[PDB]
Every structure is written in C-alpha cells, then in structure tokens.
Amino acid sequence: VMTVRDFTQVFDSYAQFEESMIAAKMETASELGREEEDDVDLELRLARFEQLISRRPLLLNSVLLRQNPHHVHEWHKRVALHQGRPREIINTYTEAVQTVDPFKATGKPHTLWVAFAKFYEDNGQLDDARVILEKATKVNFKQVDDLASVWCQCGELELRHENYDEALRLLRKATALPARRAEYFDGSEPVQNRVYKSLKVWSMLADLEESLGTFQSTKAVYDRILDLRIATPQIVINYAMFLEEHKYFEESFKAYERGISLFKWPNVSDIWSTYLTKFIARYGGRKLERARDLFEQALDGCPPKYAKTLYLLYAQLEEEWGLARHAMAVYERATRAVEPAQQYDMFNIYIKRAAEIYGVTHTRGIYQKAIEVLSDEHAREMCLRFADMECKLGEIDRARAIYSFCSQICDPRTTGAFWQTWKDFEVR
Amino acid sequence: EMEMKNRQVNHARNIWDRAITTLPRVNQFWYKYTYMEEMLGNVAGARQVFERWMEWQPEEQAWHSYINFELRYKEVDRARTIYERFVLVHPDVKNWIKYARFEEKHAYFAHARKVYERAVEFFGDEHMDEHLYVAFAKFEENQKEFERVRVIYKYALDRISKQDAQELFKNYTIFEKKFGDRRG
Amino acid sequence: PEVRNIVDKTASFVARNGPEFEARIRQNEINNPKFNFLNPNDPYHAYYRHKVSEFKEGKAQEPS
C-alpha cells in the first residue's frame, strides 16, 4: 500500500466479510482499526465494524481509542480510553494507560499518569500504584511543575484513602523530598517557582486549615520555609493557621513581614493591614501606642489602597482611643492625604470631623482649606455649603466675600440659583 | 604594519618581538601584535606573549582587556589562574567589585563565599569604601536569605559618620523589604 | 517608624515655611544622622520629597 484509504478498502472488504470465520469473527475489523497511528482517518474501520448493520461493536471503542490518543501525548488518549472504559475484557485498560510516543510535553504524561493511577485504583488500588508513582515521580531533575502536581495528586488519592496514618507517612516523605531540591534545573522557566507546588504539597501534608489535623507548631514555619522566599495565595489562610496554632504577636509580625515582602503595594499588604488592626486589638492590646506607630509606619506614604483609605482605620482608632488632641492632628494629617482622587467623600468626612469636634473656627479653617484644594466642583460646592453655614451663623461679611470667591470659581455653565440665593440672603 | 600588510609572517614576528622587547612601556606595539595574532591562530605562543605583557606591570586598560580575551574563548580554569595576581597590584573598587565576577558567570557558590570573605577582610577595614557592600547585598538579594541581614545593618561598626548618605538609605530599606519570604 | 515620622514631620515644617528650611535644617544637622534623610545619600530621601509637596497640597495624613 502507498498511503491512506487502502486500509479503508480492506476495511469495507471486511464489512462485506463481516463473518469471515468461525473463530475470531472478522478480527480484520479491529486489525484494520489499528491501522497507521493517528491523524489520518481511524474512523473508517471502526465505523464499518459498527456499521455492519447495527448491534454494537464493543471492539471499536478500544480499537479506535487505542491508536495514539494525545500528536504525541494529548487528550487523544481519552478517546482510546473511552471504549469499554469501566470494564471490557479487564484488559484494554492497559492500552488506555499505554501512550508512549516520547516527545516534548508538559503536564500531559503526569495528568494521564494520575488518571492511569485511578485506573490502577480500580485495578486493585495499591497494586501497581506505588510503582507508577515511583516511576512517574522522577523525570529528569526537577525543572517541572507536573512532578509535584502528580505527587500532590497521589496525596489527594491518599486523602481518599480514609485513615491518615499511611497517607501521612507517605505524604510526609514525599512532601519532604522537594525540601532538599525544588526546581530550576533546565527549561523555559527562569526561576524555580516552588511556592505553588511546594506550598501545595506542604499544605496537603499538614496545616490544611479545613479538616485534617496533625499540624505541628513548626509546620507553619515549614510552609513559610517551603515557599522559602514569599508566597501569598494562602497568606490569609497561612496567617490564620499560624494564629490558630499560636495566636500571639509573633505570628502577626511575621504575617506583616510576609505580607509586605509577599507582593508590593496593598495587595497582600492590605490584608496585612486588616490583620494588623485585628491583631493589634486582639494581641497588642486596645489603645496601644505601638499599634498606632506600626499601623501608621507601614501604611504611611501608601498608594490609594482600593479606592482610598489613609485615615478611617487610624483616624477612627485615634479618635476612639480617648485623646481629643491627637485626633485633630490625625484629622489634619489625614486631611492632607484625604482625597487624592478629589472625591467629595473624604471632604465631607473632614468637614464632618471638624463639625463634631472643636467648633466654629474649625469649620472656618476647614472652609478655607476646602476652598484651597480645588478640582472642578469641589471648591464651589464646599465654599457654597460652608458659605451658607457661615452666613446662617456668623455675619454677612463671609457671605459677601464668599460670593466674590464664588465669582472667581464655579464656571457659569447654567447655574443662576446661587446668584439669586446669595442676593436674597443679602436682602435678608 | 608594512610587514604585516605583506604575507611574510616570520620576518614580521622577528621585528615585532625586538620592537616589544626594545620598548616595553608603550602599549600600541603589543596591542597590534596581539591583534595580528587575533587574525592568526590561538596557539600557546600568544599566551606566552600575554604573560610577558602581564609581566611588565601595565595599567587596568591592558589587564581587563586580557581577561576579556580569556572570556572570548570560553576559558574557565586558566582565566581563574591568571586573575589571582590581578588584585595584588591595583586595589581599585572597580576591581574589588569585579573580583566577584564568577558569581555572575558560574555562581561559584562555596568559592563565592570564599571570595566574599576576601572582599570583607581586605582594605576598607573601618570605612567600607562605600561601594563594595552594595554589590555584595545585590548578589545576596539575587541569592536567598542566607546572610543578607548581617552586612547592611548588623555589621555597622565600619560606618562613615552616618553609615550612608541620604541618597541610598531608604533605598537600602526598600531593598530589604519587598524581596523576602513576606511573612505576616 | 521613627524615620518615616521625622521625614513626615520635617517635610510638614519645610512644606509650610518653604524649602528654605530644608537647607537650614540640612546644614544645621549635616553631621547628625537624625537628619541624614535630607541628603540624597539616604534611601528614604525620595519618600520625603513627596511628603513636602503633599503637605503643601494639604492632602497627606498627619502623624499620630
């Protein structure tokens, strides 16, 4: 034969041959279904064997799914694994685990090897499973994320194993193996990146923060050492586990350092600020000077958080600490950083903070400060509200001068109400 | 250059060697003869010419040119061999930071610790020369958290009246902050 | 943090009285490491630069 469609002619020749013997019963249908390798036809011989008239081939599932599923390694192995998947002869499952065709692949032989380990779990469980885990455990030297993912998958199958004695021993040794060597040998990965996989194996071994126990007091430091530099997918759950095992200020400071070095800007540092306030209240003591010193020290310059918070945590915490002096200082220093986006929220929070404390003169200083900072409508609305509030209380000099200030600002647009209201207020 | 322009190489070497042994202190004769040997092969007689060129004690411009010559043919052992006599002549900080170059070439781990011992015991005993520990902490930040806390803040006995100028102290602080394990 | 507090506070005074004070304070404590931050030789020098402008704009958060 030269090329494809010859095994299709022999295929249909076996379709008219549908019973060619009294023994194998037209084995040339499956033999034709095994023709070539992949990516040619592969549907002609199986489609003919099932196309005789109709009954069911029961062969064509493993025969069509037995020819190179997953170029090289790929999802095509599931196609060859689909025919008689739970049981056929209790044989072709090995062909489902049979892939070979060595080539460049990442994660496919490991995931298909874990699925083959599940087929080994239906094969009698521990029989042949440990040999598959040990054979697939070593591929080159590290430098792959599929290795620790397959070992962690074996750890999940060990979680399906009920009692955690042997699962904790094998998961303890297999989880302790990456501790010596992790990744970054050769490949396209510039760094090792052992935080994800290594922290996943260490988390599956101990300190799951959900159900499984047997987490030593040093297991949290074993996870933080498993990341070995910084990791913060779990920083909230990791700090929560360290708080569950300890609940002291050392875990709070270690969570603040791990959150600061974790990722720049308030990404994990915002969670370090929430855990810094909650840990400041529940550990460092209520109304503590060191809590405000550290909270104001870490968040000092800052970018504008999510939207912005430079104040309410430290400003409200300082106002509720029992000191009416430093509350005003934190109100002015918080007023400088109040609204980097020029939002009226922080403006009304500063004007309200000056309204509930001090008195008139503070509202006048907040009126001049609110009129100093201007974006578009900020100085007009603030100067108008403080102008009416000052005219309803003080003399009419601040109303006339506030009107002259309202002439230089508040571009005309439509308006017209402020001029008539100011004229009526001057008439009154 | 006239005898080099022609195809006669034997009389060329016979005039080049007496030229360079007559006038050792000039650089251009040795430079153009070694460049003619760049046009020629890489035989060990070139290395004999280069070790004679090391023997007359020239400036930095010759010596780091010869180590670039050793780099452009991928020599690991011999370039390490010729570089031990380099530091004992010129104690320049530009050469103190570049004696620690096998770190950025081979990563040299245990002998990198030995080279960093050599960087910490020599001159700059109480004043640090304000530049060596910058590159030391730079490579140690390129490495893990082995001994990076000690050198910048805890080995502060060798300060120069403020331990640093204003231009780099907060840079030291943010150099320590966001490149660690980042614990809570 | 002391460094950020002295930076923030010094920046505030220099923000109100003008940069003429930055020079005074810098030359008045040039040998004193408590003010080393005012020179470009310190790591937080860049942080302070922002604080001055910020206090002038009247938007920053005063200390506590």
Coordinates of all heavy atoms in Angstrom, one line a residue, chain A residues 119-248, unseen atoms left out:
Chain A
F119 N -7.2 4.5 37.3 CA -7.5 3.1 36.7 C -6.7 2.0 37.5 O -7.2 0.9 37.5 CB -7.1 3.1 35.3
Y120 N -5.6 2.4 38.1 CA -4.9 1.4 39.0 C -5.7 1.3 40.3 O -5.6 0.2 40.9 CB -3.5 1.8 39.2
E121 N -6.4 2.3 40.7 CA -7.2 2.2 41.9 C -8.4 1.3 41.7 O -8.8 0.7 42.6 CB -7.7 3.6 42.3
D122 N -8.9 1.3 40.4 CA -9.9 0.3 40.1 C -9.3 -1.0 39.7 O -10.1 -1.9 39.4 CB -10.8 0.9 38.9
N123 N -8.0 -1.1 39.6 CA -7.3 -2.3 39.3 C -6.9 -3.1 40.5 O -6.2 -4.1 40.4 CB -6.0 -2.0 38.5
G124 N -7.5 -2.8 41.7 CA -7.0 -3.3 43.0 C -6.2 -2.3 43.8 O -5.5 -2.8 44.8
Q125 N -6.3 -1.0 43.6 CA -5.7 0.0 44.4 C -4.2 -0.1 44.5 O -3.6 0.0 43.5 CB -6.4 0.0 45.8
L126 N -3.7 -0.3 45.7 CA -2.2 -0.2 45.9 C -1.4 -1.1 45.0 O -0.2 -0.8 44.8 CB -1.8 -0.5 47.3
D127 N -2.0 -2.1 44.4 CA -1.3 -2.9 43.4 C -1.0 -2.1 42.2 O -1.9 -1.5 41.6 CB -2.1 -4.1 43.0
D128 N 0.3 -2.0 41.8 CA 0.9 -1.3 40.7 C 0.8 0.2 40.8 O 1.3 0.9 40.0 CB 0.2 -1.7 39.4
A129 N 0.1 0.7 41.9 CA 0.0 2.2 42.0 C 1.3 2.8 42.5 O 1.8 3.8 42.0 CB -1.1 2.5 43.0
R130 N 2.0 2.1 43.5 CA 3.2 2.7 44.0 C 4.3 2.6 43.0 O 5.2 3.5 43.0 CB 3.6 1.9 45.3
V131 N 4.3 1.6 42.1 CA 5.3 1.6 41.1 C 5.1 2.6 40.0 O 6.0 3.2 39.4 CB 5.3 0.2 40.4
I132 N 3.8 3.0 39.8 CA 3.5 4.1 38.9 C 3.9 5.4 39.5 O 4.4 6.3 38.8 CB 2.1 4.1 38.5
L133 N 3.7 5.6 40.8 CA 4.0 6.9 41.4 C 5.5 7.0 41.5 O 6.1 8.1 41.4 CB 3.4 6.9 42.8
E134 N 6.2 5.9 41.8 CA 7.7 6.0 41.9 C 8.3 6.1 40.5 O 9.4 6.8 40.3 CB 8.3 4.8 42.6
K135 N 7.7 5.5 39.5 CA 8.2 5.7 38.1 C 8.0 7.0 37.5 O 8.9 7.6 36.9 CB 7.6 4.6 37.2
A136 N 6.8 7.6 37.8 CA 6.5 9.0 37.3 C 7.0 10.0 38.3 O 6.8 11.2 38.0 CB 5.0 9.1 37.1
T137 N 7.6 9.7 39.4 CA 8.0 10.7 40.4 C 9.3 11.3 40.0 O 9.6 12.5 40.4 CB 8.2 10.1 41.8
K138 N 10.1 10.6 39.2 CA 11.4 11.1 38.8 C 11.4 11.3 37.3 O 11.4 10.3 36.5 CB 12.6 10.2 39.2
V139 N 11.4 12.6 36.8 CA 11.6 12.9 35.4 C 12.6 14.0 35.3 O 12.5 15.1 35.8 CB 10.2 13.4 34.8
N140 N 13.7 13.7 34.6 CA 14.9 14.5 34.6 C 15.3 14.9 36.0 O 15.3 14.0 36.9 CB 14.7 15.7 33.7
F141 N 15.7 16.1 36.2 CA 16.0 16.7 37.5 C 15.1 17.9 37.7 O 15.4 18.9 37.1 CB 17.5 17.0 37.7
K142 N 14.1 17.7 38.6 CA 13.1 18.8 39.0 C 12.7 19.6 37.7 O 12.4 18.9 36.7 CB 13.8 19.8 40.0
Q143 N 12.7 20.9 37.7 CA 12.5 21.7 36.5 C 11.2 21.4 35.8 O 11.0 21.6 34.6 CB 13.6 21.5 35.5
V144 N 10.2 21.0 36.6 CA 8.8 20.7 36.0 C 7.8 20.9 37.1 O 8.1 20.6 38.3 CB 8.7 19.2 35.5
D145 N 6.7 21.5 36.7 CA 5.5 21.6 37.7 C 4.6 20.4 37.6 O 3.7 20.3 38.5 CB 4.7 22.9 37.3
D146 N 4.8 19.5 36.7 CA 4.0 18.3 36.6 C 4.4 17.3 37.6 O 3.5 16.5 38.1 CB 4.0 17.7 35.2
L147 N 5.6 17.2 38.0 CA 6.1 16.3 39.0 C 5.4 16.4 40.3 O 4.7 15.5 40.8 CB 7.6 16.4 39.2
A148 N 5.6 17.6 41.0 CA 4.9 17.9 42.3 C 3.4 17.9 42.1 O 2.7 17.7 43.2 CB 5.4 19.2 42.8
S149 N 2.9 18.2 41.0 CA 1.4 18.1 40.8 C 0.9 16.6 40.8 O -0.2 16.3 41.2 CB 1.0 18.8 39.5
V150 N 1.8 15.7 40.2 CA 1.4 14.3 40.2 C 1.6 13.7 41.6 O 0.8 12.9 42.1 CB 2.2 13.5 39.2
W151 N 2.6 14.1 42.3 CA 2.8 13.7 43.7 C 1.7 14.2 44.6 O 1.2 13.5 45.5 CB 4.2 14.1 44.2
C152 N 1.3 15.5 44.4 CA 0.2 16.1 45.2 C -1.1 15.4 44.8 O -2.0 15.2 45.7 CB 0.1 17.6 44.9
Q153 N -1.2 15.0 43.5 CA -2.4 14.2 43.2 C -2.4 12.8 43.9 O -3.5 12.4 44.3 CB -2.5 14.0 41.6
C154 N -1.3 12.2 44.0 CA -1.2 11.0 44.8 C -1.5 11.3 46.3 O -1.9 10.4 47.0 CB 0.2 10.4 44.6
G155 N -1.2 12.5 46.7 CA -1.6 12.9 48.1 C -3.1 13.1 48.2 O -3.6 12.8 49.3
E156 N -3.8 13.5 47.1 CA -5.2 13.6 47.2 C -5.8 12.2 47.2 O -6.8 11.9 47.9 CB -5.7 14.4 46.0
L157 N -5.3 11.3 46.3 CA -5.7 9.9 46.4 C -5.4 9.3 47.7 O -6.1 8.4 48.2 CB -5.0 9.1 45.3
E158 N -4.4 9.8 48.4 CA -4.1 9.4 49.8 C -5.1 10.0 50.8 O -5.4 9.4 51.8 CB -2.7 9.7 50.2
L159 N -5.7 11.1 50.4 CA -6.8 11.7 51.2 C -8.1 10.9 51.0 O -8.9 10.8 51.9 CB -7.0 13.1 50.9
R160 N -8.3 10.3 49.8 CA -9.4 9.4 49.5 C -9.1 8.0 50.2 O -10.0 7.2 50.1 CB -9.6 9.2 48.0
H161 N -8.0 7.8 50.9 CA -7.6 6.5 51.4 C -8.1 6.4 52.9 O -7.7 5.4 53.5 CB -6.1 6.4 51.4
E162 N -9.0 7.3 53.4 CA -9.5 7.2 54.7 C -8.4 7.4 55.7 O -7.7 8.5 55.7 CB -10.2 5.9 55.0
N163 N -8.0 6.5 56.6 CA -7.1 6.7 57.7 C -5.8 7.4 57.2 O -5.2 7.0 56.2 CB -6.8 5.4 58.4
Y164 N -5.4 8.4 58.0 CA -4.3 9.2 57.6 C -2.9 8.8 58.1 O -2.0 9.6 58.0 CB -4.6 10.7 58.1
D165 N -2.9 7.6 58.7 CA -1.6 7.1 59.1 C -0.6 6.9 58.0 O 0.4 7.7 57.8 CB -1.7 5.7 59.8
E166 N -0.9 6.0 57.1 CA 0.0 5.7 55.9 C 0.0 6.9 54.9 O 1.0 7.2 54.3 CB -0.5 4.4 55.2
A167 N -1.2 7.6 54.8 CA -1.2 8.7 53.9 C -0.3 9.9 54.5 O 0.2 10.6 53.7 CB -2.6 9.2 53.8
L168 N -0.2 10.0 55.8 CA 0.6 11.0 56.4 C 2.1 10.6 56.4 O 3.0 11.5 56.4 CB 0.2 11.3 57.8
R169 N 2.4 9.3 56.4 CA 3.8 8.9 56.3 C 4.3 9.0 54.9 O 5.3 9.6 54.7 CB 3.9 7.4 56.8
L170 N 3.6 8.5 53.9 CA 4.0 8.6 52.5 C 3.9 10.0 52.0 O 4.7 10.5 51.3 CB 3.1 7.7 51.6
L171 N 2.9 10.8 52.5 CA 2.8 12.2 52.1 C 3.8 13.0 52.9 O 4.1 14.1 52.5 CB 1.4 12.7 52.4
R172 N 4.3 12.5 54.0 CA 5.3 13.2 54.8 C 6.7 13.0 54.1 O 7.5 14.0 54.0 CB 5.4 12.7 56.2
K173 N 7.0 11.8 53.7 CA 8.3 11.6 53.0 C 8.3 12.2 51.6 O 9.2 13.0 51.2 CB 8.6 10.1 52.9
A174 N 7.2 12.0 50.8 CA 7.1 12.5 49.5 C 6.9 14.0 49.5 O 7.3 14.7 48.6 CB 5.9 11.9 48.8
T175 N 6.3 14.6 50.6 CA 6.3 16.0 50.8 C 7.6 16.6 51.3 O 7.9 17.8 51.0 CB 5.2 16.4 51.8
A176 N 8.4 15.8 52.0 CA 9.7 16.2 52.4 C 10.8 16.1 51.4 O 11.9 16.7 51.5 CB 10.1 15.5 53.7
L177 N 10.5 15.4 50.3 CA 11.5 15.3 49.2 C 11.8 16.6 48.5 O 13.0 16.9 48.3 CB 11.1 14.2 48.2
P178 N 10.8 17.4 48.1 CA 11.1 18.7 47.5 C 11.8 19.7 48.4 O 12.4 20.7 47.9 CB 9.7 19.2 47.1
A179 N 11.9 19.4 49.7 CA 12.5 20.4 50.6 C 14.0 20.4 50.3 O 14.6 21.5 50.4 CB 12.3 19.9 52.0
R180 N 14.6 19.3 49.8 CA 16.1 19.3 49.5 C 16.3 20.0 48.2 O 17.2 20.9 48.1 CB 16.6 17.9 49.5
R181 N 15.5 19.7 47.1 CA 15.6 20.3 45.8 C 14.2 20.5 45.3 O 13.4 19.6 45.4 CB 16.5 19.4 44.9
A182 N 14.0 21.7 44.7 CA 12.7 22.1 44.2 C 12.6 22.1 42.7 O 12.0 21.3 42.1 CB 12.3 23.4 44.9
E183 N 13.2 23.1 42.1 CA 13.0 23.3 40.7 C 14.2 24.1 40.1 O 15.3 24.3 40.8 CB 11.7 24.1 40.4
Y184 N 14.1 24.7 38.9 CA 15.1 25.5 38.2 C 16.4 24.7 38.0 O 17.4 24.9 38.6 CB 15.4 26.7 39.1
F185 N 16.3 23.7 37.1 CA 17.4 23.0 36.5 C 17.6 23.4 35.1 O 18.6 24.0 34.8 CB 17.2 21.5 36.7
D186 N 16.7 23.0 34.2 CA 16.8 23.4 32.8 C 15.4 23.5 32.2 O 14.5 22.7 32.6 CB 17.7 22.5 32.0
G187 N 15.1 24.4 31.3 CA 13.8 24.6 30.7 C 13.6 26.0 30.4 O 14.5 26.9 30.4
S188 N 12.3 26.4 30.1 CA 11.9 27.7 29.8 C 11.5 28.5 31.0 O 11.1 29.7 30.8 CB 10.7 27.7 28.8
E189 N 11.6 28.0 32.2 CA 11.3 28.7 33.4 C 12.5 29.4 34.0 O 13.4 28.7 34.4 CB 10.6 27.8 34.5
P190 N 12.6 30.7 34.0 CA 13.8 31.4 34.5 C 14.0 31.1 36.0 O 15.2 31.0 36.4 CB 13.5 32.9 34.3
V191 N 13.0 31.0 36.8 CA 13.1 30.8 38.2 C 12.6 29.4 38.6 O 12.0 28.7 37.7 CB 12.4 31.9 39.1
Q192 N 12.7 29.0 39.9 CA 12.2 27.7 40.3 C 10.6 27.7 40.5 O 10.0 26.8 40.0 CB 12.8 27.3 41.6
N193 N 10.1 28.8 41.1 CA 8.7 28.9 41.4 C 8.2 27.7 42.2 O 7.3 26.9 41.7 CB 7.9 29.1 40.1
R194 N 8.7 27.5 43.4 CA 8.3 26.4 44.2 C 7.2 26.8 45.2 O 6.8 25.9 46.0 CB 9.5 25.8 45.0
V195 N 6.7 28.0 45.1 CA 5.7 28.4 46.1 C 4.4 27.7 45.8 O 3.8 27.1 46.8 CB 5.4 29.9 45.9
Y196 N 3.9 27.7 44.6 CA 2.7 27.0 44.2 C 2.7 25.5 44.5 O 2.0 25.0 45.4 CB 2.4 27.2 42.7
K197 N 3.6 24.8 43.9 CA 3.7 23.3 44.0 C 4.2 22.9 45.4 O 3.6 22.1 46.1 CB 4.5 22.7 42.9
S198 N 5.3 23.5 45.8 CA 5.9 23.1 47.1 C 4.9 23.5 48.3 O 4.8 22.7 49.2 CB 7.2 23.8 47.3
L199 N 4.3 24.7 48.2 CA 3.4 25.1 49.2 C 2.1 24.2 49.2 O 1.4 24.1 50.2 CB 3.0 26.6 49.1
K200 N 1.8 23.7 48.0 CA 0.6 22.8 47.9 C 0.9 21.5 48.5 O 0.0 20.9 49.1 CB 0.2 22.7 46.4
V201 N 2.1 20.9 48.3 CA 2.4 19.7 48.9 C 2.6 19.8 50.4 O 2.2 18.9 51.2 CB 3.7 19.1 48.3
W202 N 3.2 20.9 50.9 CA 3.3 21.2 52.3 C 2.0 21.4 52.9 O 1.7 21.0 54.1 CB 4.3 22.3 52.6
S203 N 1.1 22.1 52.2 CA -0.3 22.3 52.7 C -1.1 21.0 52.8 O -1.9 20.8 53.7 CB -1.0 23.3 51.9
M204 N -0.9 20.1 51.8 CA -1.6 18.8 51.8 C -1.0 17.9 52.9 O -1.7 17.0 53.4 CB -1.5 18.2 50.4
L205 N 0.3 18.1 53.2 CA 0.9 17.3 54.3 C 0.4 17.7 55.7 O 0.1 16.8 56.5 CB 2.4 17.3 54.2
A206 N 0.4 19.0 55.9 CA -0.1 19.5 57.2 C -0.6 20.9 57.1 O -0.3 21.6 56.1 CB 1.1 19.4 58.2
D207 N -1.4 21.3 58.0 CA -1.9 22.7 58.1 C -2.8 23.0 56.9 O -2.5 23.8 56.1 CB -0.8 23.7 58.3
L208 N -3.9 22.2 56.7 CA -4.8 22.4 55.7 C -5.9 23.5 56.0 O -6.5 24.0 55.1 CB -5.6 21.1 55.3
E209 N -6.0 23.9 57.3 CA -6.9 24.9 57.7 C -8.4 24.6 57.4 O -9.2 25.5 57.3 CB -6.5 26.3 57.1
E210 N -8.7 23.4 57.2 CA -10.1 23.0 57.0 C -10.5 21.8 57.9 O -11.4 22.0 58.7 CB -10.2 22.6 55.5
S211 N -10.0 20.6 57.7 CA -10.4 19.5 58.4 C -9.2 18.7 59.0 O -9.1 18.6 60.2 CB -11.2 18.5 57.5
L212 N -8.3 18.2 58.2 CA -7.2 17.4 58.6 C -6.4 18.1 59.6 O -6.0 19.2 59.5 CB -6.4 16.9 57.4
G213 N -6.0 17.3 60.7 CA -5.2 17.8 61.8 C -3.7 17.4 61.6 O -3.2 17.3 60.5
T214 N -3.1 17.1 62.8 CA -1.7 16.7 62.8 C -0.8 17.8 62.2 O 0.2 17.5 61.5 CB -1.5 15.4 62.1
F215 N -1.0 19.0 62.6 CA -0.2 20.1 62.2 C 0.7 20.6 63.4 O 0.1 21.1 64.4 CB -1.0 21.3 61.6
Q216 N 2.0 20.4 63.3 CA 2.9 20.7 64.4 C 3.0 22.2 64.5 O 2.7 23.0 63.6 CB 4.2 20.1 64.2
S217 N 3.5 22.7 65.7 CA 3.7 24.1 65.9 C 4.7 24.7 64.9 O 4.7 25.9 64.6 CB 4.1 24.4 67.3
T218 N 5.6 23.8 64.4 CA 6.7 24.2 63.5 C 6.2 23.9 62.0 O 7.0 24.2 61.1 CB 8.0 23.4 63.7
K219 N 5.0 23.4 61.8 CA 4.5 23.2 60.5 C 4.3 24.4 59.7 O 4.4 24.5 58.5 CB 3.3 22.3 60.5
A220 N 3.8 25.5 60.4 CA 3.6 26.8 59.8 C 4.9 27.3 59.3 O 5.0 27.9 58.2 CB 2.9 27.8 60.7
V221 N 6.0 27.2 60.1 CA 7.3 27.6 59.7 C 7.9 26.7 58.6 O 8.8 27.0 57.9 CB 8.3 27.7 60.9
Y222 N 7.3 25.5 58.5 CA 7.7 24.5 57.5 C 7.0 24.9 56.1 O 7.6 24.6 55.1 CB 7.3 23.1 57.8
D223 N 5.8 25.6 56.2 CA 5.2 26.1 55.0 C 5.9 27.4 54.5 O 6.2 27.6 53.4 CB 3.7 26.3 55.2
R224 N 6.1 28.3 55.5 CA 6.8 29.5 55.2 C 8.2 29.2 54.7 O 8.7 29.9 53.8 CB 6.9 30.4 56.4
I225 N 8.9 28.2 55.2 CA 10.2 27.8 54.7 C 10.0 27.0 53.4 O 10.9 26.9 52.6 CB 10.9 26.9 55.7
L226 N 8.8 26.4 53.1 CA 8.6 25.7 51.9 C 8.5 26.7 50.7 O 9.0 26.4 49.6 CB 7.3 24.9 52.0
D227 N 7.9 27.9 51.0 CA 8.0 29.0 50.0 C 9.4 29.5 49.9 O 9.8 29.8 48.8 CB 7.0 30.1 50.3
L228 N 10.1 29.6 51.0 CA 11.5 29.9 51.1 C 11.8 31.4 50.7 O 12.9 31.9 51.0 CB 12.3 29.0 50.2
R229 N 10.9 32.1 50.0 CA 11.1 33.5 49.8 C 9.8 34.3 50.1 O 9.8 34.9 51.2 CB 11.5 33.7 48.3
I230 N 8.8 34.2 49.3 CA 7.5 34.7 49.6 C 6.5 33.9 48.8 O 6.7 33.6 47.7 CB 7.4 36.2 49.4
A231 N 5.3 33.7 49.4 CA 4.1 33.2 48.7 C 2.9 33.9 49.3 O 2.7 33.8 50.6 CB 4.0 31.7 48.7
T232 N 2.0 34.5 48.5 CA 0.8 34.9 49.1 C -0.5 34.6 48.3 O -1.3 35.5 48.0 CB 0.7 36.4 49.4
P233 N -0.7 33.3 47.9 CA -2.1 32.9 47.7 C -2.8 32.6 49.0 O -4.0 33.0 49.2 CB -1.9 31.6 46.8
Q234 N -2.1 32.0 49.9 CA -2.7 31.5 51.2 C -2.4 32.4 52.3 O -2.7 32.1 53.5 CB -2.1 30.1 51.5
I235 N -1.7 33.6 52.1 CA -1.3 34.5 53.2 C -2.3 34.7 54.2 O -2.0 34.7 55.4 CB -0.8 35.8 52.6
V236 N -3.6 34.9 53.8 CA -4.7 35.0 54.8 C -4.9 33.7 55.5 O -5.0 33.7 56.7 CB -6.0 35.4 54.1
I237 N -4.9 32.6 54.8 CA -5.1 31.3 55.4 C -3.9 30.8 56.1 O -4.0 30.1 57.1 CB -5.5 30.2 54.4
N238 N -2.7 31.2 55.6 CA -1.5 30.8 56.3 C -1.3 31.6 57.7 O -1.0 31.0 58.7 CB -0.3 31.1 55.5
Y239 N -1.6 32.9 57.6 CA -1.6 33.7 58.9 C -2.7 33.2 59.8 O -2.6 33.3 61.0 CB -1.7 35.2 58.6
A240 N -3.9 32.8 59.2 CA -4.9 32.2 60.1 C -4.5 30.9 60.7 O -4.9 30.6 61.9 CB -6.2 32.1 59.3
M241 N -3.7 30.1 60.0 CA -3.3 28.9 60.6 C -2.2 29.1 61.7 O -2.2 28.5 62.7 CB -2.7 27.9 59.5
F242 N -1.3 30.0 61.4 CA -0.3 30.4 62.4 C -1.0 31.1 63.6 O -0.5 30.9 64.8 CB 0.7 31.4 61.9
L243 N -2.1 31.8 63.4 CA -2.9 32.3 64.5 C -3.6 31.2 65.3 O -3.9 31.3 66.5 CB -3.9 33.4 64.1
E244 N -4.0 30.1 64.6 CA -4.7 29.0 65.2 C -3.7 28.2 66.1 O -4.1 27.8 67.2 CB -5.4 28.1 64.2
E245 N -2.5 28.0 65.6 CA -1.5 27.3 66.4 C -0.9 28.1 67.5 O -0.3 27.5 68.4 CB -0.4 26.7 65.4
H246 N -0.9 29.4 67.3 CA -0.2 30.3 68.3 C -1.1 31.3 68.9 O -1.3 31.4 70.1 CB 1.0 30.9 67.6
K247 N -1.6 32.2 68.0 CA -2.4 33.4 68.5 C -1.5 34.3 69.4 O -1.8 34.4 70.6 CB -3.7 33.0 69.2
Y248 N -0.5 34.9 68.8 CA 0.4 35.8 69.5 C 0.8 36.9 68.6 O 0.4 37.0 67.4 CB 1.6 35.0 70.1

